[PDB]
């Protein structure tokens, strides 16, 4: 029941020969997992944990200089020289400067200047890379009892693809993922600012124009290319002065706007990515399926409540005898001859008399009934619901766009149950994905809304050339309208 | 020799007394008596409830 | 099975700091927030504030906002915590209690069963 | 703060009804409002969360519900050893908790 009230929560139906199922989990996002005579589960990874990291690259913020030394080269007897130049620790230039007989040299022209400051950093920034083996994905499983720890806590690792959940009268879920098929991490690095951090690419993060060392340095004071965190000016000519630049850990946050929050303070935790599993659902088995339901009267506790769904959900309790018994529940039209809505939390039963149940499901779209118990004592609250078949179409369709759009191919494998048409999809939008993928790279959401209109202009103006070039124009489009960044 | 003071430009800054107060659906946006103490900046945003 | 396990009592002149601590046993430390309720003899319960023992957020209520500071202790399982400017209406038994946390560690909604578990008490004299 | 009666007392066997009364930012506003019982030198106790249920160990004889801005403890067949101080508990939308303002219960003799 802990995937009640979530906006991001999706439903799968049926399963396959094998008895098993290919999912998708996303942090934030919780999946209802129902099949005919099996019990409905529901899935929502809820920590990602990484052990380890190695530490790869500092880049620096705070840097001070001091120990400034100029020396004074006449023109045309070569450059000048420094003892602290020696060492790298200095950061130093050559530059150009006038000299003369008020300068004390005896000939009149441009003579050198070089000024050397040792740098000294005292805010910096850590860059750490754990490795792919190193994943740690906890996912809360949590069945619909009804009941108001209730839910069971499982580790993914990569060393065990096979991981075995215990649920007390569920049976045992055969639950199998790829920790690795996800966010692909040997290609990312974590970066540690002082308290906040962000997970984003590594070859962005090489690509800082910041002082940096390597993450194997221990002395942390051979920096390199620190001309881009200070600066020589010459006002007139006569002189060269070296100041270092300011505080660059608010330009980091501007520079940080599409990655993602994550929290490595205690230990690396992530709140984000996707993690495509197998469900397999063999061993599962209906709690309470031995059991005659209740002949006795019921009581509704707490009022009908509509989530953003559509789905329903009920609290009753239950006052007859044979406890514990199925509640006689099921959706019934105004003419009380179809059974048009379906539940979703199969197979609800009363474990103790007095402890209300939670019965929670979807009723038809307009009117329906609603029914628990049986003749005499039927409970009678009919329902009101807004929408139409048309519009939870368009809806549905508009999610599943949005899913394929922000997951990739593995979106195929949401639902997919093997299906030749599946792995057909999954060829060709992995393919497309990845011609994409590498035209778009690095492009702003303006990019792509702009690209796609030019395309879009360029096929209405053109043949199976035309209809395809609108095609993608309007998909690109789509995506760039829907992308955050 | 005489300069005069235009605006100040504030380039660090401290958060402290974190507040927060949250709505029912369709019960509006909630308000709080720092949201008119323009000391304290707020957003309103939407929450699954 | 749960078991909380508070300090003994202690008697100080007003004005003075008071520290106490609570010992959680029998189940996950981290993953619950612990709250302190103190109570006046003859008087009303009063929520002091809570600590999280995940992260290690503190709140602290209006009237001892500038009174109360809450540490913890992941290593011993126990949290510590100090009341300083006592007055004579300071005197009161404290009470520990438990609340878990979210899936993400926060505690931005408590549970529907929080409270479920209290500690022996604490009293605190002032004279 | 809120507001429930000093003292209730009942015969024993009986069933009597408690009310707790706050504001629509505690008690009206969110259904977190639970009760407590404070027996002499000994730490409270919780026998009733989210009123609508019940806690695990506690007897089926108290019962809670909600009424707008004021929130009912009915507890039926009343017994010796309910004689104790109650308490009622409601957390706000500022993210702070109140609590009653104590009530003892006596049973007749």
């Known amino acids: 029941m802990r995937c009640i009230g979530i906006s991001n929560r999706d439903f799968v139906e049926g399963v396959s020969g094998g008895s098993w199922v290919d999912i998708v989990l996303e942090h934030g996002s919780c999946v209802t997992t129902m099949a005919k005579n099996k019990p409905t589960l529901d899935f929502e990874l809820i920590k990602t944990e990484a052990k380890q990291p190695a530490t790869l690259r500092k880049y620096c913020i705070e840097a001070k200089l001091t120990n400034t030394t100029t020396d004074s080269r006449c023109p045309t007897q070569g450059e000048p020289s420094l003892n602290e130049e020696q060492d790298k620790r200095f950061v130093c230039k050559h530059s150009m400067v006038d000299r003369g007989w008020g300068n004390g040299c005896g000939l009149f022209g441009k003579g050198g200047i070089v000024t050397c400051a040792m740098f000294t950093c005292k805010k910096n920034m850590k860059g750490k890379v754990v490795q792919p083996e190193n994943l740690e994905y906890t996912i809360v499983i949590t069945p619909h009892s009804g009941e108001e720890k209730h839910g069971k806590e499982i580790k993914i690792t990569p060393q065990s693809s096979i991981t075995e959940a215990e649920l007390t009268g569920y049976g045992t879920v055969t639950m199998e993922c790829s920790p690795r098929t996800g966010l692909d991490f040997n290609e990312m690095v974590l970066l540690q600012m002082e308290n906040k951090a962000w997970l984003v690419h590594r070859q962005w993060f090489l690509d800082l124009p910041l002082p940096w060392l390597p993450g194997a340095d221990t002395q942390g004071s051979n920096w390199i290319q620190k001309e881009t965190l200070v600066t020589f000016k010459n006002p007139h000519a006569k002189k060269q002065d070296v100041v270092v630049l300011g505080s660059q850990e608010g330009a980091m946050h501007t520079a940080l706007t599409g990655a993602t929050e994550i929290q490595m303070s205690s230990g690396n935790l992530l709140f984000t990515g996707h993690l495509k599993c197998r469900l397999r659902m063999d061993k599962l088995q209906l709690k309470g399926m031995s059991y005659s339901m209740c002949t006795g009267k019921f009581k509704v506790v707490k009022e009908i409540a509509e989530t953003q769904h559509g789905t329903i959900v009920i609290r009753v309790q239950y006052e007859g005898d044979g406890s514990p018994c199925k509640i006689p529940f099921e959706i019934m039209d105004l003419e009380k001859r179809h059974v048009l809505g379906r539940l979703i939390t199969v197979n609800p039963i009363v474990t103790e008399k007095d402890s209300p149940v939670n019965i929670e499901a979807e009723p038809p779209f307009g009117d329906s009934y609603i029914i628990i118990g049986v003749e005499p004592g039927q409970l009678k609250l009919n329902w009101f619901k807004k929408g139409s078949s048309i519009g939870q179409m368009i809806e549905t369709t508009m999610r599943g766009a949005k899913r394929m759009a922000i997951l990739g191919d593995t979106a195929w494998d949401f639902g997919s149950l093997g299906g030749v048409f599946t792995s057909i999809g999954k060829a060709l939008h992995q393919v497309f994905g990845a011609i994409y993928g590498a035209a778009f790279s690095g492009v702003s959401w303006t990019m792509k809304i702009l690209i796609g209109v030019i395309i879009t202009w360029i096929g209405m103006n053109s043949t199976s050339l035309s209809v395809s070039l609108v095609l993608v124009g309007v998909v690109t489009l789509y995506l760039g309208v829907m992308v955050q960044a | 020799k005489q300069p005069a003071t235009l605006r100040k430009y504030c380039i660090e800054a401290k958060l402290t007394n974190t507040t927060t107060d949250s709505r029912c659906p369709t019960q509006g946006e909630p308000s709080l008596n720092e949201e008119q103490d323009k000391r304290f900046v707020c957003k309103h945003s939407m929450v699954d409830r | 099975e749960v078991q909380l396990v508070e300090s003994g009592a202690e008697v100080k002149k007003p004005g003075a700091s008071v520290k106490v601590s609570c010992k959680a046993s029998?189940?996950?430390?981290?993953?619950?927030?612990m709250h302190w309720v103190r109570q006046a003899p003859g008087q009303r319960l009063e929520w002091m504030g809570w600590?999280?023992?995940?992260?290690?957020?503190?709140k602290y209520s209006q009237k001892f906002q500038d009174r109360v500071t809450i540490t913890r202790d992941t290593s011993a399982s126990t949290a510590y915590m100090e009341l300083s400017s006592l007055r004579s209406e300071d005197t009161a038994i404290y009470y520990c209690?438990?609340?878990?946390?979210?899936?993400?560690?926060?505690?931005?909604?408590?549970?529907?069963?929080?409270?479920?578990?209290w500690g022996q008490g604490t009293l605190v004299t002032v004279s | 703060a809120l507001t429930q009666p000093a003292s209730v007392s009942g015969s024993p066997g009986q069933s009597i009804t408690i009310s707790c009364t706050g504001t629509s930012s505690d008690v009206g506003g969110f259904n977190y409002v639970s009760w407590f019982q404070q027996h002499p030198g000994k730490a409270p106790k919780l026998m009733l969360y989210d009123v609508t249920s019940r806690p695990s160990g506690v007897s089926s004889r108290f019962s809670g519900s909600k009424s707008g801005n004021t929130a009912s403890l009915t507890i039926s067949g009343l017994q010796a050893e309910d004689e104790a101080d109650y308490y009622c508990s409601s957390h706000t939308s500022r993210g702070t908790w109140v609590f009653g303002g104590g009530t003892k219960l006596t049973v007749l003799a």
């Open positions: 209690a438990r609340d878990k946390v979210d899936d993400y560690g926060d505690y931005w909604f408590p549970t529907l069963w929080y409270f479920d578990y």
């Open positions: 029998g189940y996950t430390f981290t993953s619950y927030a």
């Open positions: 600590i999280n023992a995940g992260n290690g957020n503190t």
